[PDB]
């Protein structure tokens, strides 16, 4: 599927991911595009933080969904 990651700067990254993918895996894809390493990445969806160990399916993140990237927490 396809999802969007909105940075604090305003930039909007588009990621191709499958729902089986872990949040850790999503952060690796963000590293590919934006060069920020996963240790610094913090992904926020529905006002909560998303755990690296859980999948996109676990959180009910679907096609065209938008996640918020934050750095160093």
């Amino acid at each position: 599927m396809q999802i969007f990651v909105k940075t604090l700067t305003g930039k909007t990254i588009t990621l191709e991911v499958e729902p089986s993918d872990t949040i850790e895996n999503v952060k690796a894809k963000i590293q590919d595009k934006e060069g920020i390493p996963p240790d610094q990445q913090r992904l926020i969806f529905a006002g909560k933080q998303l755990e690296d160990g859980r999948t996109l399916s676990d959180y009910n993140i679907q096609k065209e969904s938008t996640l918020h990237l934050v750095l160093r927490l």
């Binding site: 089986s20 993918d21 872990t22 850790e24 895996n25 690296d52 160990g53 999948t55």
Partner: peptide
């Protein structure tokens, strides 16, 4: 709990069904 990839040796989460780094299918 984490599983080491057979190919690139990277330690992935139990929930994952593919390696985060090399994207090989989990055994």
């Amino acid at each position: 709990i984490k599983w080491a990839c057979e190919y690139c040796t990277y330690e992935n989460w139990p929930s994952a069904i593919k390696c985060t780094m090399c994207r090989a299918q989990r055994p």
